[PDB]
Design a protein around this ligand. Sequence first.
Ligand code: CL
Lengths: 348, 11
Amino acid sequence: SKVTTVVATPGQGPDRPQEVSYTDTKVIGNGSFGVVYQAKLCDSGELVAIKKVLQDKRFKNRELQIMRKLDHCNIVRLRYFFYSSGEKKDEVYLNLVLDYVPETVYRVARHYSRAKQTLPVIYVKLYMYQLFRSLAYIHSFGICHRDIKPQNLLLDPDTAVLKLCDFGSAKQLVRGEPNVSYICSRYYRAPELIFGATDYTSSIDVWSAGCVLAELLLGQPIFPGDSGVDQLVEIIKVLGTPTREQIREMNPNYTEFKFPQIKAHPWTKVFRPRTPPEAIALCSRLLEYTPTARLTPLEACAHSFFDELRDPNVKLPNGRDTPALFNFTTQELSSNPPLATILIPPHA
Amino acid sequence: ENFRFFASRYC
Ligand SMILES: [Cl-]
């Protein structure tokens, strides 16, 4: 067994560097600045993932600064960080040591879809609720993730615990300070991003979250396409042509362009006939052109679609307890504190 | 496909 030691700083708690030892290193994925490793910490036996991110000498790394201040059961935990060399010669890389989670929402979704089966709705409810909580939490700091997609939703399939990860695009949005439009991944981008807006809000994450919900209900992405124009055609086929008033809420530079002229498809026909009507209702309040008309994450947690999760006797299909769903904090509740009446049921 | 990890219990 090859043991490796490094000097590293705890992700949370005091800034005192400590000796960290790990072993059982093995490649588990590919990253944008080098491959991603798994390792086992010698002191606890816990598995971690180690991701390289490449340090800017001019700026503090934004992802590291965000990760150090987040503490939530549905967000991946930063255990340690340290600097090293790596792929490119002479380059210094930031290494983020994250708690390892073995699967993703995308893996589970593809497993059902390949089998031509639909994900059981109880899991759709559990996953989407946990994602909306993670989003309520980061949004309460003003932090927008900007790359919500199924592959960024870590999942422990045994316990049904979901954790949001990959904050490499996240940013604290400030009104009246522009943001690059080129973030968020194909299939999940809000139409104001497709239109190249620089003045969007955290509601781009809610659109992406609606895309994930629709995907879980359909067994395939709802707005596929390799170009923004192909993606927009799929959006227009569902929502219909945006009005000039809607376009001006998305990007007013686009109001006078020629768009495909298409009537909205009825929401009840977008999904299979036996899709639960509350899921369709929820989806229709997330996939809205007007960004301010989309539900907030906290409003989405309180939606009727999630009422089964507030039932005292709800259980996982495998017979286990559901994960923690009601340990809201003042921080997490701050966008609308008296939603706790729905959010925290009596037995909590 | 577009998977995060190389390995999975579902493949
Ligand atoms: Cl994945």
